[PDB]
Write an enzyme that holds these catalytic residues in place. Structure first.
Site, mmCIF file in Angstrom:
data_model
loop_
_atom_site.group_PDB
_atom_site.id
_atom_site.type_symbol
_atom_site.label_atom_id
_atom_site.label_comp_id
_atom_site.label_asym_id
_atom_site.label_seq_id
_atom_site.Cartn_x
_atom_site.Cartn_y
_atom_site.Cartn_z
ATOM 1 N N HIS A 163 184.527 79.477 87.322
ATOM 2 C CA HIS A 163 184.215 78.245 86.151
ATOM 3 C C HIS A 163 183.704 77.142 86.172
ATOM 4 O O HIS A 163 183.642 76.730 86.379
ATOM 5 C CB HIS A 163 185.488 78.288 85.498
ATOM 6 C CG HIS A 163 185.978 79.421 84.538
ATOM 7 N ND1 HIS A 163 186.310 78.637 83.643
ATOM 8 C CD2 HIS A 163 186.016 80.789 84.621
ATOM 9 C CE1 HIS A 163 186.736 79.315 83.153
ATOM 10 N NE2 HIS A 163 186.826 80.839 83.557
ATOM 11 N N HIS A 219 183.634 91.269 86.192
ATOM 12 C CA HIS A 219 184.557 92.331 85.148
ATOM 13 C C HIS A 219 185.151 92.976 86.425
ATOM 14 O O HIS A 219 185.832 94.179 85.393
ATOM 15 C CB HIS A 219 184.425 91.748 83.607
ATOM 16 C CG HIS A 219 184.626 90.812 83.282
ATOM 17 N ND1 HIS A 219 184.862 90.778 82.303
ATOM 18 C CD2 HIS A 219 184.991 89.761 83.235
ATOM 19 C CE1 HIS A 219 184.950 89.829 81.339
ATOM 20 N NE2 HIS A 219 184.925 89.086 82.166
ATOM 21 N N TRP A 276 190.881 95.282 82.814
ATOM 22 C CA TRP A 276 189.494 96.165 82.901
ATOM 23 C C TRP A 276 189.009 97.537 83.330
ATOM 24 O O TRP A 276 189.234 99.265 82.630
ATOM 25 C CB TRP A 276 188.329 95.539 82.996
ATOM 26 C CG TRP A 276 188.048 94.085 82.681
ATOM 27 C CD1 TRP A 276 187.825 93.633 80.764
ATOM 28 C CD2 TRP A 276 188.435 92.945 82.400
ATOM 29 N NE1 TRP A 276 188.117 92.853 80.073
ATOM 30 C CE2 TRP A 276 188.294 91.995 81.653
ATOM 31 C CE3 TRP A 276 188.447 92.650 84.333
ATOM 32 C CZ2 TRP A 276 189.127 89.940 82.103
ATOM 33 C CZ3 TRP A 276 189.416 90.872 84.500
ATOM 34 C CH2 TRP A 276 189.071 90.169 83.253
HETATM 35 C C1 HEM Z 1 180.336 86.108 78.248
HETATM 36 C C2 HEM Z 1 180.960 86.391 79.597
HETATM 37 C C3 HEM Z 1 182.433 86.104 79.760
HETATM 38 C C4 HEM Z 1 183.426 85.479 79.289
HETATM 39 C C5 HEM Z 1 183.632 85.711 78.025
HETATM 40 C C6 HEM Z 1 184.761 85.583 80.042
HETATM 41 C C7 HEM Z 1 186.054 85.773 79.977
HETATM 42 C C8 HEM Z 1 187.274 85.618 80.493
HETATM 43 C C9 HEM Z 1 188.794 85.003 79.948
HETATM 44 C C10 HEM Z 1 188.891 84.968 78.410
HETATM 45 C C11 HEM Z 1 189.217 86.083 81.145
HETATM 46 C C12 HEM Z 1 190.743 85.805 81.157
HETATM 47 C C13 HEM Z 1 191.011 84.905 82.190
HETATM 48 C C14 HEM Z 1 193.104 85.096 82.625
HETATM 49 O O1 HEM Z 1 193.297 85.094 81.956
HETATM 50 O O2 HEM Z 1 193.569 83.650 82.887
HETATM 51 C C15 HEM Z 1 188.558 85.857 82.262
HETATM 52 C C16 HEM Z 1 188.894 86.483 83.087
HETATM 53 C C17 HEM Z 1 188.163 86.375 85.167
HETATM 54 N N1 HEM Z 1 186.687 86.021 84.972
HETATM 55 FE FE1 HEM Z 1 185.746 86.120 83.069
HETATM 56 N N2 HEM Z 1 184.306 85.656 81.664
HETATM 57 C C18 HEM Z 1 182.918 85.476 81.535
HETATM 58 C C19 HEM Z 1 182.112 86.263 82.457
HETATM 59 C C20 HEM Z 1 182.438 85.849 83.490
HETATM 60 C C21 HEM Z 1 181.795 85.563 84.618
HETATM 61 C C22 HEM Z 1 180.317 86.250 84.768
HETATM 62 C C23 HEM Z 1 182.697 86.107 86.001
HETATM 63 C C24 HEM Z 1 181.918 85.481 87.020
HETATM 64 C C25 HEM Z 1 181.978 86.331 88.736
HETATM 65 C C26 HEM Z 1 183.604 86.076 85.353
HETATM 66 C C27 HEM Z 1 184.610 86.349 86.282
HETATM 67 C C28 HEM Z 1 186.276 86.526 86.053
HETATM 68 C C29 HEM Z 1 187.330 86.745 86.752
HETATM 69 C C30 HEM Z 1 187.280 87.648 87.789
HETATM 70 C C31 HEM Z 1 188.513 87.075 85.671
HETATM 71 C C32 HEM Z 1 189.828 87.580 85.815
HETATM 72 C C33 HEM Z 1 190.597 86.555 85.949
HETATM 73 C C34 HEM Z 1 192.086 86.463 86.812
HETATM 74 O O3 HEM Z 1 192.086 87.602 87.426
HETATM 75 O O4 HEM Z 1 192.512 85.788 86.733
HETATM 76 N N3 HEM Z 1 184.105 85.816 84.083
HETATM 77 N N4 HEM Z 1 187.143 85.984 81.937
#
Ligand code: HEM
Ligand code: HEM
Lengths: 667, 657
Positions: free
Chosen positions: B72, B192, B243
């Site tokens: 982010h 993811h 996931w």
């Molecule tokens: C269209 C692309 C993407 C969408 C719509 C998206 C959306 C989201 C959402 C809604 C969450 C939930 C956050 C939470 O629940 O606190 C999340 C978490 C996360 N995102 Fe994505 N994301 C995208 C791409 C990516 C990319 C490019 C990465 C690169 C590292 C990434 C890594 C993560 C990870 C590791 C989490 C887990 C957060 C946690 O464990 O607290 N995502 N994402």
């Protein structure tokens, strides 16, 4: 609400300064030939310009009005405004309807400024041109002092019909009095200013309003910054509209004489409407009717007086003095000279800051004068003995630091008024302030500090003697040295002697009351009457001291731990062992074993319970905003690190040194 | 405030030296290059595993939170002007804290303070958060490409800045970050495979909204906490989906599940298997949810979108390709906004330069000394090129610098190469193809007969001819001055130049050359303000550069718009001293255009103008600077101020110095 604005601290930065850093205002404005400057301005006033033809063939009155409007925005509440940096070029000040047609004056003064350039600031010119115009007409003024520096970006911030559009002289009397009391002008000075400033010039209303264009800030790009373009007739000159009233006060509008008060007390005044729809007063029974000259040389005019100028005839406490002047003109000349000198020089600071050959050789009590040095200053080999004597006098570091800060934190960087010079924390308006704690340990500190100079001066090597004003600051520096030597650091706080001691007769108790801090955030004091929350007022106080964000942060962080806050309250003292200048305040509010919750006995303070549930700390709103605001939490994490203790102590010493030497314009 | 849409000059002194606590004699480059990186990784790893009571860790691992925080931080990059990304001084400041999808990142930067407090001034916050993401990635079975420190952090916020209906949306979102289809597919799939989203509560309203926004109105006492009325321990942030079955390990399980069973059911937000659930996944505290109640917000477009599904289905049986492509994509994502490879520090940076970094060949010859520079300067002054050609060519090559992400500049010698030589502003029908030809002939004749192993590169000649010009113009104005020149640039080739990645660098409107392309959002003056903010120029440097380039012949197509001078091609302050001339009356030209004309010398027209080069006499805050340079005694100061500004802008991309 809106989050606090830290951009207010770093206003007027160096990168916006075209003159660079190696620029000294005084070193150059002390070299111009003021006779040549006077000749240049005098040949600018009397040569008409087709872009703005001069009424009566003399631009003088326009320049007097421009000088009055430049310096008529001073506010004793806060100090901002006034001539100062000449902000009526950039700010909303150039676009206010009140400042109509003054962009033309600043444009006419460009040929003068072009010749001199960097060695004559705009702030001087727009205040000197008026002071020369007032002397071109035959009124020997009191004196002028150059030295008000030019600034390169704006800051944060009476009806001619009296009240809000209602013509009434007695009702406009109180409005005039209140709007001139914010400048700290008594009835004699305000009457003299109104009478004197209206013996020259006329009012511009020859055409109906609603035909003028927009202000300079919203004007078309091709007007080159000259707003209020008029489409009536030719537009400028005989058909100029500036305020919508058509008043010409005296039959000699470009010469100083007692022709205002003779007209005012000579005819009977009846109400009438201007050609532009404004209210004004004209002589009753058709008296006059062809006695006042016409600027462009046409037919004469009946006598005419503004709605607020008639107040000086109906208000008893204005009527008394103005009638006396009607019987005595030289008193009017004297009072106007002194009131004008005060008006244009009010926000300029100590006497040691005026420059040039025109500065008068006398002390006026409204300047808060301090005596000149009458002995050779204390040398470095002798401030060591005095510093040791202070450190072995039984005075705690808390008391000394609190007294030194209390002396030297009454400064107003906007007004250059206050500070530690003069040693006024011993004097009446300032020893009794509530934040200073007149009770407790201020009389004790002052007594044990002035029983030290009483011994040093008597047993002194030669003519060397030390003044009390130096002793308070030297006690502050000795206390800081002692504190830092307890945290493991051996440092010396820089100290430049030279402050003198002002007696009670030279201190105006009435004047030294707006200086009283309603809220000093560094000492954790929050009195009544505060408009904003605590953190905003701390930010304002830091802005007034001309402090920056790092300096403010390090100053509060070290000043809590040094123990110099109000009533020795344990708010924000985040250290276990006090009387020691350490890093603990920053490293302890970044701790996340502490959960900050508002105190149940609601009073505006918070208590940070430890991990085990016991209450460990107890902060306040000023203290906790550093751990909350992201851009202040960023600065706390610099000094709260593990290797940044020596950096912290040197930064605190630098900020303390900067604060003590704010008022030092003599060196 | 009272004057909306007023020219905001406060953008030109963003992040001054007053607000920097570190001082002026502090260089981050020489500080961060001395830290131990093994110690840093060990400290970060002990931070990630050691959960803390005020924000407990899922599975006892803060890894995925740090990966998401690093994404982010670096996911706001905009290819339009480069602003955003992990350039330091954005994600932790006012606009990007209180932000709906930056939910738990407020209590994920304060989670790393047990490390920043150890290292302090020798490790910036941007470096720390991005490296925390990288080390979290590398401590969960993945082997990344490399890492480079150097993101100096700023101290002030920048005043500037279901099935297939989601495929095109994510495609556009990743297209305006400079990511192609394979890179975005790899980025999503890789990111993811790590962690879950979080738990869920009743709603975002009753939960994380007790005035929950870290800086706007969170309230003191809770310095950063989207507080919840549910408990915030195990269930938080109000969205529940996980996931993969191993949320703390890199293996092919995201798109084995995704291509395993259908997802036609959408529960409450995509169900699984159309009632084929189980206990495949694992929960945070204990228990176990259905067989992958996953594929959030129907972002399984990777299996629906016909061009994503091709490469994704290829990665179903070729995990090595996904591993490598995600490594490259992640390295690109977190290092996009950081600039030339000379700017990377530390011992992790890989010794392999990619085409997206705009690679520039390293120096192989000996740089020219103080005698060869004089000889070349004379040779290039006596070469049949006018001051206008030399100045406009040198400004064309070095005004393509984007200070927001340090992309462009004079280095690389790319004005002779295709993306830049054909831009409209670098008027190619005119002299550009001729100036570069004669400069190439000069270098061939010079280093063919060079003294020893000293050679000059074309990228040096364009800049040097720029300096050899203003020297000649200044000498033809009474002030003989010497313009500083630092040799060392090297020239790139068309193989190392990305033609379709420099289109974003094309000046849509250059104000110093008095250019204005069709399709400008804002008037010609705000575009100039933006241009000078991108070049990192203060307000006086704006003013002096404009007033020098006007009279010095650098106008676009040699338009006489704003040449308020009669002496052709000589360095004087005639622009300022004639713009303030009150003897002329400006008026819009009778051509229904944006150009003015100040007539009434006597009754005749003279000095055609334009909005860019006439707001200087209008805006009060710029009128002040013009009055500074237009005085009678300011002739010799304006020359040296212009020389200083010219030197600053030529050496603007010199990071190898
Ligand atoms: C269209 C692309 C993407 C969408 C719509 C998206 C959306 C989201 C959402 C809604 C969450 C939930 C956050 C939470 O629940 O606190 C999340 C978490 C996360 N995102 Fe994505 N994301 C995208 C791409 C990516 C990319 C490019 C990465 C690169 C590292 C990434 C890594 C993560 C990870 C590791 C989490 C887990 C957060 C946690 O464990 O607290 N995502 N994402
Ligand atoms: C209650 C106090 C005052 C009021 C209501 C007032 C109001 C006005 C107004 C409405 C004008 C006409 C402006 C125009 O037509 O362009 C004017 C002109 C003028 N004022 Fe004042 N003023 C006040 C105090 C002063 C003071 C304190 C001074 C000087 C120290 C001063 C000096 C002048 C002069 C010289 C002019 C003539 C301007 C010209 O001829 O263009 N006035 N005043």
């Amino acid at each position: 609400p809106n989050r606090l604005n830290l951009k207010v601290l770093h206003q007027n930065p160096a990168v916006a300064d075209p003159m660079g850093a190696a620029f000294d205002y005084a070193a150059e404005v002390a070299t111009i030939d003021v006779d040549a400057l006077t000749r240049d301005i005098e040949e600018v006033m009397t040569t008409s310009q087709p872009w703005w033809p001069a009424d009566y063939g003399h631009y003088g009155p326009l320049f007097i009005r421009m000088a009055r409007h430049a310096a008529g925005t001073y506010r004793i509440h806060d100090g901002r405004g006034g001539a100062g940096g000449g902000m009526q070029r950039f700010a909303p000040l150039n676009s206010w309807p009140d400042n109509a047609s003054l962009d033309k004056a600043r444009r006419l003064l460009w040929p003068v400024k072009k010749k001199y350039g960097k060695k004559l600031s705009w702030a001087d010119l727009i205040v000197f041109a008026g002071n020369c115009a007032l002397e071109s007409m035959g009124f020997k003024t009191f004196g002028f002092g150059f030295g008000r520096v030019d600034q390169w970006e704006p800051d944060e911030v009476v009806n001619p019909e009296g009240p809000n559009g209602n013509p009434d002289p007695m009702a406009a009397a109180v409005d005039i009095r209140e709007t001139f009391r914010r400048m700290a002008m008594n009835d004699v000075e305000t009457a003299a200013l109104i009478v004197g400033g209206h013996t020259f010039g006329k009012t511009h209303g020859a055409g109906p309003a609603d035909l003028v264009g927009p202000e300079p800030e919203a004007a078309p790009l091709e007007q080159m910054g000259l707003g209020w373009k008029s489409s009536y007739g030719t537009g400028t000159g005989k058909d100029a509209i500036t305020s919508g009233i058509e008043v010409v006060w005296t039959n000699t509008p470009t010469k100083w004489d007692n022709s205002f008060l003779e007209i005012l007390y000579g005819y009977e005044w009846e109400l009438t409407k201007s050609p532009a729809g404004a209210w004004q007063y004209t002589a009753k029974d058709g008296a006059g009717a062809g006695t006042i000259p016409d600027p462009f040389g046409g037919p004469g005019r009946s006598p005419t007086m503004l709605a607020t100028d008639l107040s000086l005839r109906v208000d008893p406490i204005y009527e008394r003095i103005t009638r006396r002047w009607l019987e005595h003109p030289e008193e009017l000349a004297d009072e106007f000279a002194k009131a004008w000198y005060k008006l244009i020089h009010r926000d300029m600071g100590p006497v040691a800051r005026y420059l040039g050959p025109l500065v008068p050789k006398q002390t006026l009590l409204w300047q808060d004068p301090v005596p000149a040095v009458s002995h050779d200053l204390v040398g470095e080999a002798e401030i060591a003995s005095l510093k040791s004597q202070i450190r072995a006098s039984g005075l705690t570091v808390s008391q000394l630091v609190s007294t030194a800060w209390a002396a030297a934190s009454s400064f107003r960087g906007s007004d250059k008024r206050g500070g530690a010079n003069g040693g006024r924390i011993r004097l009446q308006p300032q020893v009794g302030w509530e934040v200073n704690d007149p009770d407790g340990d201020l009389r004790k500190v002052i007594r044990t500090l002035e029983e030290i100079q009483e011994s040093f001066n008597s047993a002194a090597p030669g003519n060397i003697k030390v003044s009390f004003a130096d002793l308070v600051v030297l006690g502050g520096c000795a206390a800081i040295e002692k504190a830092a030597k307890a945290a493991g650091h051996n440092i010396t706080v820089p100290f430049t002697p030279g402050r003198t001691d002002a007696s009670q007769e030279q201190t105006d108790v009435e004047s030294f009351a707006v200086l009283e801090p309603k809220a000093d955030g560094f000492r954790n004091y929050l009195g009544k009457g505060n408009p904003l929350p605590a953190e905003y007022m701390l930010l304002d106080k830091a802005n007034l001291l001309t402090l920056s964000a790092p300096e403010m942060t390090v100053l509060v962080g070290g000043l809590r731990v040094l123990g110099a806050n109000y009533k020795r309250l344990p708010l924000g003292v985040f250290t276990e062992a006090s009387e020691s200048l350490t890093n603990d305040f920053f490293v302890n509010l970044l701790d996340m074993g502490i959960t900050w919750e508002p105190s149940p006995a609601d009073d505006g303070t918070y208590q940070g319970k430890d991990g085990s549930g016991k209450v460990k700390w107890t902060g306040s709103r000023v203290d906790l905003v550093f751990g909350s605001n992201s851009e202040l939490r960023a600065l706390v994490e610099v000094y709260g690190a593990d290797d940044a203790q020596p950096k912290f102590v040197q930064d605190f010493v630098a900020a303390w040194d900067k604060v003590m030497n704010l008022d030092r314009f003599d060196v």
